[model samples]
Target chain A: DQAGITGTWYNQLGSTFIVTAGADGALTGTYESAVGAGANAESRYVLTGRYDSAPATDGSGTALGWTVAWKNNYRNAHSATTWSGQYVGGAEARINTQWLLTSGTTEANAWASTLVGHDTFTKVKP
Target chain B: DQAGITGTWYNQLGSTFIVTAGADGALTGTYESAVGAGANAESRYVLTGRYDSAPATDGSGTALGWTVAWKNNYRNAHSATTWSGQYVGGAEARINTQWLLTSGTTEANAWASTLVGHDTFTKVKP
Candidate 1:
């Protein structure tokens, strides 16, 4: 069976993603992360995206690597994010990701990070 | 182990949801369904919600049942949906849902359906 991408994943920053793999090898999903300070803390930046995967070329015996593009609404503002990553570990429970802030709405200017950062995610098994 | 609500789920109508269940039994997620005419098809009415589960009261010998509340952006507008459901099948791969149109924005007025409907979801096993 294919090491299909269909499950929940999360990072140390409280960012989470749930992915659904298509029979055609395409993937669709949603992502979200918490925002704000105490008494004002709430989940925000919910986004949706699709990913395309390819065989890992690093010669490591892994299954595949992928690229992601996502768009979200943050405090009624709009923004987009991009990521490049590969699946690792048994059951592909771990996703090693590096992301960059791609675009942001004027309202998102105050908080959007332009610098690239590593934000890996681990699968949340049922 | 907890049969955690962390995964992708889909129904016959093409509606899909990506969910992440919290250790505290709190569930948070987003749901989307396709809309519009052919060749111009696009995703619409993306919503976010939470669900609280309890032991099944139907006495079917199943594990649990849940109540869900979701709010969404519909064509840049807003609306809310509500559902009462349960997890069924092996590994709780099936979610039996019944939904009702709770509220709508002026922009969602044209499409909101007041009639309650059944919308079951099946887990997209990795």
Candidate 2:
């Protein structure tokens, strides 16, 4: 089957966002936070990946492999404590499990000029 | 409340990449190994997805839909265990409650491969 869901959602804060699946069948999270001055308030974000794929053999001696790509978007408020009613920044992550601790850059606005700490999640399903 | 982060990251191993996120406030992995070596890497790989989305919901309405794009990544390592360097090859996963499964693609240096018996992670985080 196909991995992940490609859909949209509305938040309690009345924020709307878009979602997508990756080539790795993994989840790519993104939000609509184009709040602020001179912002487009865009909900169009992309995702990618780099990971492992197993082979479910139908009684074969050899196996198969796969690759994953990662990507995502976030909604940032002018001030994290309070909803400045804007998404000033976001993030994009690419994890090559084959290459642990080896990932791409992460761009996030809202917190500060710099991203001191970030949140990582676990995939409990497939 | 939203999702992952955003940014640009290089492998120095060649094949610049990217990863992104969702509004559910989960992991959104993406990449930009778009620099295909006419067929980037000239390598092989693995990956796919499934399951739940934590924080997928909030206290409002029915709760927050902490949707997870579940993106992942890897390097085929060409079954070299040395070259692949234990790379996961590919994985875009989200575990909400059950043992689910989703799949994207393992675009690689070649095909005729399999995606099974892949790997899982133990965050070991606080």
Candidate 3:
């Protein structure tokens, strides 16, 4: 079931997040990111969001399409995340997604930052 | 000796670059990046820069402490990169670096775009 993706996942940069699938298939999690990209950079936001999944075209029932939105601790800056992929077997999975900072503080500026990438999430053992 | 880092490396976001170490230990490379972070985002620059590495603090003699720079093709935008890590034993290695777009196009804005992250590069076979 969707529980396959219920665990902690981190990006190559080491920014980490956790995903939990609810009984109603609701997805929830938190994301931690370094704002500027190095030492001395601020840990800008600890975000929380919900995820929606769709069935794959192949009828495998594997969760293929994912959409997520995370709001900063203050509920100001909101990030939109869309992903395509699913858990393959056990604790391994591949996901490609786009992260867009579409609103909040930075929206006042003419530029909005975005990230397109992939990640692997490993399920943590209890 | 510094040739260990002389190859291609890419971030999880798919931005790619090639590095070559010089006879005198000087490093050279080219970097390509997507500016805004998604499908319609523009490819900002194909930049070139030199790298300087220092001896590792661990005394392993492995080249560490990397600093690099890249200028936009038009010679306007400049990016500074600093890395602190070394190639392990094989093509697989971990590097954490900070990427700063200090000048050029977006410098006028209050927010200086930055990426604090890590990457693993695989040597392309001849």
Among all candidates shown, the one with the greatest DockQ: 2
For model 3, the stretches where C-alpha displacement exceeds 4 angstroms are A34-61, A64-85, A103-115, A124-126, B1-126
lDDT of 1 at B125: 33
The list of candidate 2 runs beyond 4 A from truth reads: A5-17, A22-30, A34-113, A120-126, B1-126
lDDT for residue A48 in candidate 3, whole number 0-100: 22
Reference-based TM-score, model 1? 0.36
Cα miss at B46, model 1 (Å)?
Answer: 23
Global lDDT of each candidate: 0.40, 0.22, 0.38
- Model 2 residue A126 CA deviation (Å) reads 24
Clashing pairs in 1: none
Q: Predictions ranked by TM-score, top down?
A: 1, 3, 2
Tell me the deviation in Å of residue B96 in model 3.
34
Tens digits of lDDT, candidate 2, B1-126:
222122233343342223233333222333223222224223322222110122212221101111111222333221211011111111321111111112222434123222212112211111
lDDT by residue (tens digit), candidate 3, B78-100: 33333333333343543333222
What's each prediction's TM-score? 0.36, 0.22, 0.34
Instruction: For model 2, report the TM-score of its A chain.
Output: 0.26
